[PDB]
Amino acid sequence: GTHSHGLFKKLGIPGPTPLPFLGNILSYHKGFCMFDMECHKKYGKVWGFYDGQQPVLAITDPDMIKTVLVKECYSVFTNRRPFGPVGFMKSAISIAEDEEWKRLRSLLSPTFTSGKLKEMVPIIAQYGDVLVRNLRREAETGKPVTLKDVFGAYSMDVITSTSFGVNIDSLNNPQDPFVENTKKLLRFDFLDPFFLSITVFPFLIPILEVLNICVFPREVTNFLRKSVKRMKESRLEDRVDFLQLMIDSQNSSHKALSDLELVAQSIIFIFAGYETTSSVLSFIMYELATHPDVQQKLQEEIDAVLPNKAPPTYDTVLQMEYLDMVVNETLRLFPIAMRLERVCKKDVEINGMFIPKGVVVMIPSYALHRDPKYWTEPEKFLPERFSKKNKDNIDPYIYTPFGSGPRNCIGMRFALMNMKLALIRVLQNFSFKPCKETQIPLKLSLGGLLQPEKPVVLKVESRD
Amino acid sequence: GTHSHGLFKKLGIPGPTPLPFLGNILSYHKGFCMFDMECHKKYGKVWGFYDGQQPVLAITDPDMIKTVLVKECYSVFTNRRPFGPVGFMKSAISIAEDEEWKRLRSLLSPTFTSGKLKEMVPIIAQYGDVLVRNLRREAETGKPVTLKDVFGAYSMDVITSTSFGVNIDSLNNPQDPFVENTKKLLRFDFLDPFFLSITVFPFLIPILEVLNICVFPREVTNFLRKSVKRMKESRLEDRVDFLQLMIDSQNSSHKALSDLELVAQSIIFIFAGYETTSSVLSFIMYELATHPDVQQKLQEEIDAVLPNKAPPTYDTVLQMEYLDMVVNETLRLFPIAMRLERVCKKDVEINGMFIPKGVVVMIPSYALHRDPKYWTEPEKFLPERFSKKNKDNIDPYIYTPFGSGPRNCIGMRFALMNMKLALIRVLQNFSFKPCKETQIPLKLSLGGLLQPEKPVVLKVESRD
Ligand code: HEM
Ligand code: HEM
Ligand SMILES: CCCCNc1ccc2c3c(cccc13)C(=O)N(CCCC)C2=O
Ligand SMILES: CCCCNc1ccc2c3c(cccc13)C(=O)N(CCCC)C2=O
């Protein structure tokens, strides 16, 4: 039960001693983030641990992190940890490996250009207005509002319309078969029973693939596959969404995106942007209600750029420095990816350190973001860290809320524009105050997702 | 049960239609060799079939075969089919993959040079004499002789002494712990129940690895590991064998052969040279007893080069053209590897044919060796095919008894020198005649090893 549990003693690398079979998973009782803080404080710059039989080497050195995420990305550190039975979703860009990934990123990167993005702002902006009208009636009511649900619906509306050209008010159509399915595409909690068991029993993943058992519920994938097949066959008789952009890239080097590859990207885009965007949007409105100074300052900035509740535009969005500072400071405190990982594909020596084939090199983003050594008052919400007076003292490989290098988040600038468009229209119309249900201070789940312990609820007063 | 069973219909490639789950394995009731002849005759140049869910594309075109075994060996077609739970034997050169294999072949090729080989002939030659004295007493007795056993013991003696510097008369020491274990390293019958089940249930191989269950009986591997560890620790206090040559290459580019890598090569060498050498030596003496003309002609050639029962030498061995013709013609009829295989590592187009990632490209050596289109009277034993008058009409990619290109048999010229040294000393002293037990004509097993149906027995008369 300890065939590989000797690797870090032999390489001289420190860390918590592993138990036969389990590795260090019982140390996850407090969640990925507490585990990474404790190891960092205890073992220092570099340390190892075992997810079952799987050795994970954590690195915290900015120069080492860059070699991994940027320098030897293609040569050595190309892929993330395989994580369970995955079926045809093996070809979604976030899961594909080595040369297939590079072909998919080349094929899909033209779809996330700033040019295409500002062509999508009129679509996103429309559901900002839907978000507002939904919020006002739950404000005129005066009853506390669950951000998870108002911003979930917003994020869904922006995916349904920019991904597929489907226009739904999901908040007022929770039974549209398109909403019911897509709502099921939540992010994975790698500390829940199924994934914990998979971690101790990875030899069982090939058995689940053969039974077409899949972490993506084949009930929802099947729906979307046949949905996309329908949109693909319609339209062609008679738009600026992701699906169309992928239909078009099938008409030119690299082999055009096959029909099933295409569907796989549509799905992963949903999975990668849905519960993420809503989690950040909720964390941000949590900090704005517990720091009224900042909320007022931001409402003041928005009103100056968009006088008279003027509708936001791509260009007026990139203008708002304080809004950028607020978004960023929220992502420092709550980097919802928690860790970046890369599989070491071959024996290497980066920065004087020998990394053997097979190890999972992991960057504890949550921990580096709250390290005393780089950040004053590291638990405080303090947007002035990202003022231009201060943002140059910030290491791009310490602050990695979207990752770094060729395999960073391909939807970053889309996700930032989307969240800010939401915030502008929400703050033009409303102020957000705490309640008695409001967990102050916010507690994070001990699970495997960086999310509040209990969901966040707030007062929403109308400014008019 | 037919997720991949549609590949050859879609690519336009012909072949026998597969059954859910099984693929075409039930067609193996007649053995690998009959299956390959029937498909060749029926589907022609190229055809596909499924070993369980595993698609195998057979190719018979000499130009296509060369692209696979020679041209795109490193780029595309580097590795053989994985075949079962294999433990630490994952690093033996015949099993290792991609860049690890290339490092091992670079490290071990200097050990199979002609220079080192003629330095080993005095060792091999010694057990030729042991073979003779063993044969004479079973000849003076007059009782039929089982070649499997006389040549098994010969091959063992040559491995024990050239591999490890261990000198045993295995025929007269069947209880030496070193003989008992090494005798257990027989070749795999991929049509026996365990490997058939593995072929239908490959998703179970990771479960067997985790239980340290291994196709190499960990009872024998453990013995040799600790044996080599002993020879390694002895000697060093106080030789021209393979082990020493590997000890020496650990003292220089590529990282020297680690202690466990070294042991893995020692073992695989045994597995690759033991039952192979004895099978060919037995097939050859079968043809010499059923073609007395050829046996006399060869005895005549040997006596001319080595007058007065003179002991053979490296240089007098490469002299004997008829002996070379006999060995080669026997290997045509009985290429004991039966097939060469390479895994297609990425989508390629060789010779106008699209090969997708994952397919096992297989070369039916047995079948090409008995193809009417290249060979007159293809079932006849006719050594004059390899006379210099005729051997230029022979395609090196049709006749592939040791494979071809960078991944051919690294012990070829050793195995040829070894078999010929055996034949010379045996034919200087004895003539071999059939018996009534002698299966005429020889029938091949319907199993997965190319071997006689019933073992071969012969009269052995002394020439003096
Ligand atoms: C606030 C919202 C989001 C955050 C914080 C976020 C964060 C991240 C992080 C940390 C990574 C890992 C990159 C690495 O390993 O270095 C990632 C990858 C990725 N993200 Fe985002 N993401 C967000 C929203 C989105 C959206 C809206 C999309 C697309 C519509 C998206 C698509 C992807 C994809 C496809 C990957 C995998 C990229 C690849 O492997 O090539 N994400 N994300
Ligand atoms: C008559 C005796 C033998 C025959 C007919 C034979 C035949 C073969 C064949 C057909 C291959 C496959 C090559 C390919 O895939 O193209 C092979 C590989 C190999 N043989 Fe032999 N072999 C014999 C004896 C030996 C001996 C004596 C040794 C070493 C002592 C040996 C070591 C190997 C090894 C290590 C491989 C794998 C090479 C690699 O993957 O790099 N064989 N053999
Ligand atoms: C063989 C599969 C075992 C399944 N098990 C895990 C799968 C994936 C991950 C994983 C992680 C920890 C423990 C188990 C697994 C992990 O940190 N990450 C990085 C993202 C941070 C939240 C993973 O992608
Ligand atoms: C996933 C493992 C399934 C096990 N099963 C087989 C393993 C290996 C081979 C194999 C073959 C046929 C059918 C099953 C397997 C085969 O032809 N060769 C080439 C050598 C010719 C005798 C193999 O190395």
From Swiss-Prot, chains A, B:
Membrane topology (UniProt): Single-pass membrane protein
Compartments it resides in: Endoplasmic reticulum membrane; Microsome membrane
Outcome of swapping residue 145 to I: In allele CYP3A4*9
Record pathway: Steroid hormone biosynthesis; Cofactor metabolism; retinol metabolism; Steroid metabolism; cholesterol metabolism; Lipid metabolism; fatty acid metabolism
Effect listed in the UniProt record for changing residue 434 to S: In allele CYP3A4*19
Cofactors that this protein relies on: heme
Documented effect of changing residue 340 to F: In allele CYP3A4*12; has an altered testosterone hydroxylase activity
UniProt note on regulation of activity: Activated by cytochrome b5.
Effect of residue 412 to T: In allele CYP3A4*3
Effect seen on changing residue 383 to L: In allele CYP3A4*13; lack of expression
Outcome, altering residue 268 to T: In VDDR3; 10-fold increased activity towards calcitriol; no effect in protein abundance; decreased activity for non-vitamin D substrates
Sites where the protein binds heme: 409
Source superkingdom: Eukaryota
Biological-process GO terms, alphabetical: aflatoxin metabolic process; alkaloid catabolic process; androgen metabolic process; cholesterol metabolic process; estrogen metabolic process; lipid hydroxylation; lipid metabolic process; long-chain fatty acid biosynthetic process
Induction: By drugs, such as rifampicin.
Result after altering residue 93 to V: In allele CYP3A4*4; significant decrease in catalytic efficiency
Outcome (variant: residue 149 to H): In allele CYP3A4*10
EC number(s) from the headed UniProt entry: 1.14.14.1, 1.14.14.56, 1.14.14.73, 1.14.14.55
Reported function: A cytochrome P450 monooxygenase involved in the metabolism of sterols, steroid hormones, retinoids and fatty acids. Mechanistically, uses molecular oxygen inserting one oxygen atom into a substrate, and reducing the second into a water molecule, with two electrons provided by NADPH via cytochrome P450 reductase (NADPH--hemoprotein reductase). Catalyzes the hydroxylation of carbon-hydrogen bonds.
Disease cited in the entry: Vitamin D-dependent rickets 3: An autosomal dominant disorder of vitamin D metabolism resulting in early-onset rickets, reduced serum levels of the vitamin D metabolites 25-hydroxyvitamin D and 1,25-dihydroxyvitamin D, and deficient responsiveness to parent and activated forms of vitamin D.
Family, as annotated: Belongs to the cytochrome P450 family.
UniProt name for this protein: Cytochrome P450 3A4
Organism expressing this protein natively: Homo sapiens
